[PDB]
Design a protein around this ligand. Sequence first.
Ligand code: CLA
Ligand code: CLA
Ligand code: CLA
Ligand SMILES: CC(C)=CCC/C(C)=C/CC/C(C)=C/CC/C(C)=C/CC/C(C)=C/CC/C(C)=C/CC/C(C)=C/CC/C(C)=C/CC/C(C)=C/CC1=CC(=O)C(C)=C(C)C1=O
Ligand SMILES: CCCCCCCCCCCCCCCC(=O)OC[C@H](COP(=O)(O)OC[C@@H](O)CO)OC(=O)CCCCCCCCCCCCCCC
Lengths: 51, 249, 30, 61, 170, 57, 147, 122, 137, 33, 93, 50, 170, 37
Amino acid sequence: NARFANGKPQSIEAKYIMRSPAEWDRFMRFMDRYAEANGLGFSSXXXXXXX
Amino acid sequence: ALTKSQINELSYLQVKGTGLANRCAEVVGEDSIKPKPGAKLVDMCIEPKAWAVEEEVGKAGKTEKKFVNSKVMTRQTYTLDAIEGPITVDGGKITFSEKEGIDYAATTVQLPGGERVPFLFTVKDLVAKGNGDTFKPGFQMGGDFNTPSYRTGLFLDPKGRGGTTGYDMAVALPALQLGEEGDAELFGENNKVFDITQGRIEMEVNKVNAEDSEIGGVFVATQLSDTDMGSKTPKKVLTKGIFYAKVEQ
Amino acid sequence: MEALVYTFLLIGTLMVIFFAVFFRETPRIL
Amino acid sequence: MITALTALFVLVSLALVVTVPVALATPGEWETSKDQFNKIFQLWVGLVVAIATADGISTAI
Amino acid sequence: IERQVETSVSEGLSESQAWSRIPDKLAFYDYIGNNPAKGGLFRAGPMNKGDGIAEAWLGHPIFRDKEGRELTVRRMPAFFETFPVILVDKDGIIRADIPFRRAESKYSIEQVGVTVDFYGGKLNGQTFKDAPTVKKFARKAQLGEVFEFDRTSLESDGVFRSSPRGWYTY
Amino acid sequence: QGMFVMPFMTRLGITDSWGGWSITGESVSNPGIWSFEGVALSHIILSGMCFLAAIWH
Amino acid sequence: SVFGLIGDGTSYSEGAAYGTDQADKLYSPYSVYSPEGEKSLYKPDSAEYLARKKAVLAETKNRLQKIPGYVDKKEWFNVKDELTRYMYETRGAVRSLSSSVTQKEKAEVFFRALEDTYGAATLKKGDAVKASNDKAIAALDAFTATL
Amino acid sequence: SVSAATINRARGLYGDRIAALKDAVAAGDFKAIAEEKNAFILFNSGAYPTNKAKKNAAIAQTNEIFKAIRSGDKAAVKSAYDAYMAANDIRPLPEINANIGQGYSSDFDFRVRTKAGAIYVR
Amino acid sequence: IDLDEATRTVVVDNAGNTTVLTPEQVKRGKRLFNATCGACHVGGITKTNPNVGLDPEALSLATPRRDNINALVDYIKNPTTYDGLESIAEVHPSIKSADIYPRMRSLTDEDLYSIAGHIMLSPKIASEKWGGGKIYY
Amino acid sequence: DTRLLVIAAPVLVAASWALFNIGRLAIQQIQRL
Amino acid sequence: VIDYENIGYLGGSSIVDINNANIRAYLKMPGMYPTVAGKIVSHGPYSGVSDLYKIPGLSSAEADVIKKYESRLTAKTPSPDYVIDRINNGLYR
Amino acid sequence: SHFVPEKPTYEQGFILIQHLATLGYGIGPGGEITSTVPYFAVGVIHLISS
Amino acid sequence: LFLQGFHNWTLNPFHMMGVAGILGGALLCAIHGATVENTLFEDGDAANTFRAFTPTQSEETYSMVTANRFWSQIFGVAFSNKRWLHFFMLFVPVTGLWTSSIGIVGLALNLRAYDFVSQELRAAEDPEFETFYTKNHLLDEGIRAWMAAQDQPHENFVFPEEVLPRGNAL
Amino acid sequence: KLPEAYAFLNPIVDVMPVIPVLFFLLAFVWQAAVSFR
Ligand code: CLA
Ligand code: CLA
Ligand code: CLA
Ligand SMILES: CC(C)=CCC/C(C)=C/CC/C(C)=C/CC/C(C)=C/CC/C(C)=C/CC/C(C)=C/CC/C(C)=C/CC/C(C)=C/CC/C(C)=C/CC1=CC(=O)C(C)=C(C)C1=O
Ligand SMILES: CCCCCCCCCCCCCCCC(=O)OC[C@H](COP(=O)(O)OC[C@@H](O)CO)OC(=O)CCCCCCCCCCCCCCC
């Protein structure tokens, strides 16, 4: 590598199964609070004060 | 590291970064060439693929001299390229007689133990001598070249002392002189001598293509390390790698 | 042997800062 | 003829840069004087057009 | 120094015994390592840990060119830890030096051929036409009257100190 | 050389060091985690972690 | 006892005033913001610089003959380099040597055919390099004869 | 501070300005001595600033010049002016060259545009 | 100490012929020299080739001798090497190269007679700073 | 005569005078600044 | 080296070394600096000034200016620290 | 107004010519500037539109 | 740059205490300015808060409890006195200027931290051994040698161009 | 140089860059007219 001009730089499939599973596995924790809950617009100055 | 043909099929931008640029090309095939009076070798790629430095070794009960396989601290700046010299035959045996090219590669190679061994990997002023005529599966060349000093005399000691230039005195300690005996215990270091020593190389041509008139083989080179203007005793560096050339007519 | 004295004092300051953050005299409202 | 037309063009635009925001920032004097500034705004662009023809003709003569 | 030499050569004395009548203690005072302003803060201890115990005066160098003129090495101010070697004559024009860049130097001692002749001391009346030693005594004569020291008594370094006059008013 | 701690390290198998030198008279490319420096570093980690645990109790 | 040189900008000026046309004294520069006169004297541009310009077009054709020799020995960098290295002078020649609208059109056909060689050299397509070269050299040999 | 280079300078500056009046001793130009009275005074201050005994020697050697020209005996003027140059070593600066030279390096020197002003430019 | 008729007196012909540059023409010299030549000859040196400088000690060791007005004007018309055998107008601004250097196209006789005057008048002004390099900055 | 400098300074003046009077005019007018 | 007895023949005095002095030392000989000095400096160690003429490629009008300055040229033993900086000393002006 | 045709655009400290030059206005081969009339066109249209 | 080249003035630790006092003084001016402005109380309905202060107030206009909870929880260590804080803002810029001005009475008599000795020994016996420290000494003899011909014009330093120390090509 | 017709107005062109600074100066003038409400 070292100026191989890579995309999000990366030279193996092994780091593709590091980018996606470490985003996703700290994403699925975020989903476990915010799944199955939608809508409820509020029209205020940054309330978004639902729980 | 492929042949010179499809290295030339790559643009500059798509080699740029790959580490291809040290790689000597390869030859496919076994053939003869039979050089003519007036030919020469033109693209003499020389890459060392392993380094080795003389030392004192410990083993079963006895200490003696051998070479450790050692690693390079310079990244990729270690191979020689585009060396040319007029080829001649006088007594039936082929001589190389190096003249131009990138004929030095200032590397530094760290010993097991922490010690850094800088040297010049040179082919400067080579005169080879073949085992016969007619470049073949096993035509071996060998000769003696010149290792010049690593730093030339314009280079300057961290206090401002050099061969050509610099101070002559210990600028540090200006009350060292003061007598009949001046700084004379530092005379072995204030004196910056440009030493030049002699190396050794032994080619061994393995594969020969005469459709492109190109040879390639495996060399073994032994030479001497840096002496910081005659301060330290230089070690004996042994390199091994592959080489490559293109024959004229 | 003075690199001992250097690293004793540098780690010496790093120890004093550790006690100064975590073992401080807390201020009370009372 | 171009130099005289742009000389008139600068001197009209001096009156515009001055008298227009003085008549805009007055709460009364716009609705009454709007037909005095309409005549000069229409004249002003109609002078830009008559000066763009002048360069247009008198370059490729 | 020079007044006591002039009143000795006006008495009729030749030069090599005109300089030998100068007292050694007076020659010790015309010396850079005897300045209060020569040392530094964290150079601790006596002056003899600076350059050594003084043993004896070597001699007074007189530097001559090929025309038999006289060259004096321009002495160093007390500011400079290092000043170069510059050999000037009676009217202060450079006849010789020691070059830093040695390539195109016009005034090198090996080109001008500066010769050394001492007067008095333990090195009385000894010519030196040897071009290294001319340079060696040119570097010594830049600082002070040149003595011979003992650096091995207390392992004195090669580098200066300051007086009780320096430390009291410090 | 007056090594007091090092013979106890090598007699159970720490022969290599990060400086490339082996104590058995070899040359090693990669000693790994467990070298003379890595063992010495591991006791300073354990010194720091047992220090914090000492404060917690 | 002085009366130092006051030199307001309208007053007298020896060496230091920047009065933008005063000390030039009817040599009448190009603009007032420049020291030089405009272009009237001492270089007739129609004089013999046209040896050099025609010499560009003479050695232009020779390097363009070198191109299909380096497509067979497939050396794509040499096609891109020899089309810039000496050929840099050709645009400054042909544009400065084309006068009428017919020569400008035969310039335009030559430059597009020259740029389609470098594009096809970038794309690494050997038959399109050789084809566009034949379009190029025949556009050169047309343009040289139109003088 | 009085130093060695300050002695060298007033000697170099005004040793030109004393010895060049050898042209004015010849015809006996009586105004050309009176215009250079301050040349005698200021070489006297600069060449012996710490040495007061040689300075007060060169006071009376200067007085003997002006006492002689006030009477006007041109023989006794040169009989005193020879003694002034031969006691104090008045010397002008001669021509320097490439081997014998480098009068100045900075343009701050007191001999930049003098005839002993040259530099090996290299 | 003004810029009189004596300091403005420079060598014009190969022999000892001297003329006086008018004081408008010193200004024409210094200004046009800095505009056209000044990118590589600031302070009388050559940035692209420091061995060959604008010093009178290095103009009078040239072949032919360039220490007058007329051969400097001849140099701008027809630049040769330092030994003067072959022409370097290919790689140097000139009138033979004024199609290939656009900053030479509007110069005249009085321009180059003033520009070359500035190369000659300047070592009478400085004489150590001119072409002395960075040591005299 | 440098008529440039004799034109360049009044056009500095006539620009600096112009917009500043839009200050002064709308204050003698008094209206809602 | 602290002390090299041919300092005066490098760029100092009128007489210029042939084996060690750079191309910049030949500035002060008129007619020489391109293509004569460029040849004198690009070729090997010499024995004397008369054997400067044995350079391959050295022609007649190139050797005329050599014969003019054969009195100012001279051959010393080559110190190899000064033979690397013959093309480029590394000091410019 | 400060254009002199001798020196290139970078030497006379220009800042908005070159943005119009690399869109192909008034420039010929090698960075030589044929005329400043299209730069006059661009700059005047931005005045009246302002 | 006079006291850098001739005196190595940044290396004097009396000066380093001075820099710490002045940078730490501008530090405390930036901190206590920011925290007071940002722990302020609502004393009006204007978005401008400057008009919600009169000088005769009996209460505090910034919450010292809130400001202590800020830095103790961000930086780890915070003030808890207004009397000790404002003495500390008095103390730090002032004692910077004292300790710095002690060291400039060092150079007045040229007792200076110019070199470390053993650091400068080992360089003169190992040409391999370079630090940033020895890089600074070469820069110091650039300032010493080049400036002095035009620094002190009265001492009439004439320096040959081969004498003047210089790197490669510049 | 401007086109030869427009070359008469060269000093008027010479002020025209400065004017966007001078708007920002009125914004403090206009507050001083309104006496900094
Ligand atoms: C006015 C005070 C003064 C002065 C000028 C001197 C002068 C001298 N003494 Mg002396 N001395 C003094 C007081 C003084 N003495 C006192 C009070 C003691 C008893 C402690 C001594 C004990 C003493 C000994 C034992 C020796 C001398 C020696 C010397 C001579 C060498 C100077 C030297 O080494 O400096 C060294 C200078 C420094 C190290 C500079 C320090 C810079 C300041 C003070 C830093 C302080 C701030 C800092 C926060 C300190 C704390 C350290 C930190 C790690 C916490 C010199 C003639 C030597 C000699 O040869 O004499 C025979 C010697 O061997 N002295
Ligand atoms: C993760 C655990 C661990 C490991 C694997 C090591 C590993 C190592 N340590 Mg170590 N160490 C550790 C934790 C660890 N340490 C901790 C927690 C401490 C603090 C107490 C220390 C303190 C320490 C010191 C002070 C030293 C080491 C040393 C060493 C090295 C040599 C080991 C040796 O010779 O042991 C030898 C150990 C023994 C001979 C003890 C034997 C156990 C006794 C005799 C048992 C008798 C009582 C028992 C209850 C009997 C009843 C049971 C029976 C019925 C079966 C080795 C590299 C040495 C070294 O070289 O430093 C790097 C050294 O000097 N360590
Ligand atoms: C990068 C950060 C840095 C910092 C923070 C400092 C900080 C300091 N340096 Mg410094 N320095 C640095 C880098 C740095 N240095 C470097 C790289 C060098 C190069 C070697 C130096 C070299 C250096 C020297 C050479 C000196 C300092 C000094 C100082 C101190 C400044 C003393 C002061 O404020 O006097 C400011 C002046 C005064 C306080 C006196 C003012 C007296 C009254 C109030 C005057 C006002 C009257 C009136 C208002 C005038 C009106 C007119 C006017 C407004 C127009 C301070 C400790 C000085 C020092 O240590 O001396 C103690 C000093 O001499 N420094
Ligand atoms: C291996 C490693 C670690 C290697 C290290 C190697 C190496 C580089 C070491 C460097 C060592 C080192 C530290 C050297 C520097 C030494 C140095 C120069 C020392 C100077 C010594 C000294 C005595 C100087 C005298 C001058 C002086 C007294 C300086 C004082 C400096 C200093 C402590 C200032 C304090 C600045 C500071 C950070 C204060 C922040 C205060 C703060 C938290 C405000 C919070 C706060 C603000 C409010 O307003 C309110 C209201 C509240 C409530 C509140 O909370
Ligand atoms: C993620 C967090 C990252 C930062 C964490 C660690 C940084 C914490 C630093 C604290 C150490 C200082 C506390 C000591 C002193 C301490 O305990 O102060 C505590 C002190 C509390 O004072 P009070 O207001 O309680 O005052 C009581 C008074 O009445 C005393 O009479 O706080 C201060 O006054 C402000 C502290 C400024 C902080 C001083 C910083 C100095 C920087 C240190 C220089 C570093 C040397 C490094 C060498 C390598």
